[PDB]
Amino acid sequence: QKEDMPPEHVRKIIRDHGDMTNRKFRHDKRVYLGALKYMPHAVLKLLENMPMPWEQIRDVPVLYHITGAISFVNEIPWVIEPVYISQWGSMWIMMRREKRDRRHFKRMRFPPFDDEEPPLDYADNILDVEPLEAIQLELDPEEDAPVLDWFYDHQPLRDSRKYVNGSTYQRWQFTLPMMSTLYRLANQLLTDLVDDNYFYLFDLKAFFTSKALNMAIPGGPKFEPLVREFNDINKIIIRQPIRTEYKIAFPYLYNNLPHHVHLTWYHTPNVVFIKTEDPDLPAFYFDPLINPISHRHSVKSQEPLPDDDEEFELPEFVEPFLKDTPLYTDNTANGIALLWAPRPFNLRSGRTRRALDIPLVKNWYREHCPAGQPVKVRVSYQKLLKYYVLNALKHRPPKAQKKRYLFRSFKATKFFQSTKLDWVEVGLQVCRQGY
Amino acid sequence: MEPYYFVEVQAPADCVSAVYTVLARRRGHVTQDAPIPGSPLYTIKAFIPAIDSFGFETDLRTHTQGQAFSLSVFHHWQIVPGDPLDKSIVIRPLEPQPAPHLAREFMIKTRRRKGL
Amino acid sequence: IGVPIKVLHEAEGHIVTCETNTGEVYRGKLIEAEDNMNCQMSNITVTYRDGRVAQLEQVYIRGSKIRFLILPDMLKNMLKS
Amino acid sequence: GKSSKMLQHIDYRMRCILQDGRIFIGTFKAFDKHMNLILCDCDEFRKIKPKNSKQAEREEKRVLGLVLLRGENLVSMTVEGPPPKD
Amino acid sequence: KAHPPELKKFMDKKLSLKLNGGRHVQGILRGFDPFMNLVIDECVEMATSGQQNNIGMVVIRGNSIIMLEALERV
Amino acid sequence: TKKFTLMEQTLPVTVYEMDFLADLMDNSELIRNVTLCGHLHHGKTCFVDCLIEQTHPEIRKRYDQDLCYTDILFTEQERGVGIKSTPVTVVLPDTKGKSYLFNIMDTPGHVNFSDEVTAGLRISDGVVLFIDAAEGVMLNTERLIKHAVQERLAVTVCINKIDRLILELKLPPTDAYYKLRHIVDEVNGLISMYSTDENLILSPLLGNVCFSSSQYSICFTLGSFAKIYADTFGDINYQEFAKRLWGDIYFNPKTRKFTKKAPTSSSQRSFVEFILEPLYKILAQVVGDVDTSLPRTLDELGIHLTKEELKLNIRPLLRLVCKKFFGEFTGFVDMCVQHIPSPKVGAKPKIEHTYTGGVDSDLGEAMSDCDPDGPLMCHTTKMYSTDDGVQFHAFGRVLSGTIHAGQPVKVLGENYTLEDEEDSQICTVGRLWISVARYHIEVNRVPAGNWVLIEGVDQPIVKTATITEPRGNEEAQIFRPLKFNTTSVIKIAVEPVNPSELPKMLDGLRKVNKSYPSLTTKVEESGEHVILGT
RNA sequence: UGGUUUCUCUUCAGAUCGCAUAAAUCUUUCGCCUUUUACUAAAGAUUUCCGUGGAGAGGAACAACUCUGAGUCUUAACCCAAUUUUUUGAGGCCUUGC
């Protein structure tokens, strides 16, 4: 295998190859121009691995040309999804607590360096400086105990074989205290919807039925027409005005010509989940939100009572099955709470996802909103709903190809080496290379 | 004679008042508002007109954000309060007529429908 | 509990033939078969050792005093064992 | 050790000898603790077990069918022929 | 195990009992135990001669019970 | 392609049964015709899904839901309803082991689809009611109690979703026992109001009412749990132990016996303790103790999960633990076989309310004998569609005689009477189908008591008709038309857009009229098409 | 009747996924509208890119093994003597059949 190079090699290559005005490197003047056609791609990886405001420094692997023509970042950011949502909920809490508790928040100047300023060298201006404190909310050592040791690492439990596999960082396996702690760290970014009966006329198939017709929903998206002596008005009882949502709820019965219409899932059994307040109360008790039973019956039915002189007694070696075990532990109510939880948090184990592929604010624009809000945010929620419907509609399946691996074919050549570098150093390199 | 529909709605507590409003806007007369024993949801049993019951489910689940849920069976026939034969009352073309002449309106519409 | 015993219980409700330890042959409907091979039957034809037949409505034979039973072939299709 | 001595002969055609001296030949499909036996396509012989008796091989043969024999009344068993494929 | 014989259906019914030794008796079932020992009331010995003689209430050991037949409908 | 009936592709991997199925068909008292009804969606399909998942191994494993068997269409599979009364038939054993033959009619639960439930209920001699444990008695529950008491069948209920007591409501065991007893008492009250008969009262001690959570494959009667309890432990009479479990009955740990009051020291019931204590232990140790102390619980129950099986999420792991603890669905087999009159007994009260004439000396005794011979008669009521084919098969049950393939058929209609033989006509059987819901398979003959699809007789059977022998001196009546729980009220005026294809539209309208049992498609004097629905 | 982390290659997989979501080409309407690009917003037909899965091969171990849990001659003390079974109500005799 081609192995990692010392990080000073690419550094001195970029330092010697300056503004490419030296005569000595004129033979490389051609090569750099060709590397221009990969500068979009080298941009993408550069911004794909941006380091996450709870991080001070991220070291990324770098695939670099031997002349210093280009620097690619050869890494996909796998970010395990419950930990990612908990960390951004932590960021949400800290930023609200900072913006309320700061006398004057000075905004950054957005052309940060001046136009005629040459870019700063990493090796002297940045390499020796201690970075800063990151954001990284203070965690309770007793209440946030199974999370506190690893919660603000880059790829947190990576070298622990009990919780993930290896260093490819692909499959995670947590415990229910970990999932409980990640769940109550992320309450600021999650919802309180236990069942999807909220989305009766406001879900995906309903919006497809709306786009197939000319109908809009009052809190939903608006589209373009997909198609662009019987109904006598003295023969029709207009008793109730035909409310427009009937055309979604029952599409064939209330319209003529329902072409390209989608059927709607219309009811789930109402999930009735009692949220417990304190652990002083037991795990499952009769909650005072539940209506009592109070049995009443008129005449007693003759249910069987095998009376005395039946002489049926149990043997000595028999007991109730699990009377040795207690009825409930301190982790029972938390696990029942983890049963009705959003899709990352309702499970023990899964497969890692990219930082790209995790929408933090998707559940916020998917629900309809309380009217007290301004006009601006209502139009914005409607447009984001329209974007979600256009994403879900024109989804052709992934079309299984032959895998191509551009960066594996670059580092199989003799023109590319590989190292590991600070993200800020590679970003300064990419800016100098594109310039 | 008008057909009526027996409607059972399962709903949360503020949705009980929401069901009461939506069902009372359709000449309702809610029959029973008993709770469910062993559940925090309430059962609302009621009668409804069956001309007023085209989309009561959809309107109800829209107004209650999908919390309340409604089903409807046929069991009943009782008298339309209007005078079915009345030449004094003139029926408007499109405007919905009130209670004193609903039978006249419905008879004129069914007369114009097939029989003449 | 024995494999043959399960197959016997399977024949409950079917017409079966039973020979006793004394060679009397009882044919009719098996109502109940116990674990020990005790057999309740109904509407019997009995064929004695001399060859003569008789008819009985209801019988019960002790398992120990049964030599064997013939069951339908409907059952033959416990092939796991 | 192996328990196989019965399980080996399972599915085979088997010649079983009863305490009165009858010969039951059927397909050995199941047994148990008591040696209660399950015999498919079973016939009963009385007079002989043929070793090619030039006069005839078969007298007093009766077709029985599917037989459950109680182990109390079993004496012995030998292999009569291979399993039918069916 | 230690099972009962399923004979409650036959309780207080007249029965015909075939015993070992080619012996036959008739009487009313008054009770039983797990060994199939029986109590038979108003019992009558059916002698091989054809003659029948009343022996009253008796115990039959289940060991020697070949077969029973109900003379009633159960 | 004009197929949307979801991949029939017949490959059953049932365990050692082909001939056995038709062998149990030929017994006529070893078959049970059950119909299953619920208020709306109360778990009936996932129930029959678990039953067939018991039935068919090495395939047939469902992940994150199935419901294919009673939900084989594509509009049906997306709405959430079961719109059809899709039947199924299987063989599956008892606590003893004698496998019976079950014809499960799997009805809709929606109020507007009571037609399907009625048509299934008339052909099956037993009804099984499903009530959500967290709901109680509901609208269509009471409506189908009415319709089941009226059309003379045995009645038995099965309380489903008892996990929602545990995991959603989070009730104590005593309060959840109170709620289950309340549901049973409300069922007995609704039955006692309607039935003038008294020998139909249901109680858990009797054995007919069951308890079965169906996403996790729990199903226990008191006999089934007692059979588990006795198969683990010694030689307890599990029937006599099961008799003394439900209802105000306590275990005294000194005298080792069941009393009515005698420990009054804040004890719990026999049901509460013995049933709901270990069940809540299993549920709680799965949902909250999977990492710490779950194998310590599993070693106390004889349950051995592998390394791969322990790494599941809480829903499949909970289902797998409850499958390896409860095993088969034999309590349902107990409440069926011990309480459904298998169609020797079932013949008489059915034929005294279906047949027009009566008990009389020609037809009645031949029906109630129900031998597969003699006056060949049936009753087809459902008309099930093929995917592409114009022909849609009849579905009925053979009362007397058999049906052979190629045997010709006189279809007595419904406007037919005894002295009016112009409605009826004669046809010939195309094929005989017996269906496993997601699969179909041919038979050469169907004896008496069994359900059957008929191919090729579809032209005279609009909604209700009877099947008999052709040109035979056997002259009889027709069974009565379908009395319905609801009356069809909603009238829809209908007219085509293009008036150039009235015959094709009337053809498809006649076909959907033949499909649904209460669809009423007529033409009034003004010449506009009228569809009456529920 | 019994043992896995990482790198590369090949091959097969997208009719309920990649529980996420971009751009392009064509053809047909459009929508503005000085003309061409750059575009509006729909339907359809196709592709590219960022990702993914199953199997096989090889390399880099920085994991450690074979009286071991399971045997084809070892190893779950319990399937080992009172009527339903593995410990005989047995014993005796005689006639018939090639």
Ligand SMILES: Nc1nc2c(ncn2[C@@H]2O[C@H](COP(=O)(O)OP(=O)(O)OP(=O)(O)O)[C@@H](O)[C@H]2O)c(=O)[nH]1
């Ligand atoms: N909590 C819980 N939910 C269940 C259980 N069984 C089924 N469900 C859910 O309840 C809903 C109804 O299930 P179905 O069986 O499809 O409905 P049904 O009872 O057949 O009634 P139809 O929909 O009319 O066929 C489905 O979403 C199931 O996933 C259960 O045991 N517990």
Ligand SMILES: [Mg+2]
């Ligand atoms: Mg020009």
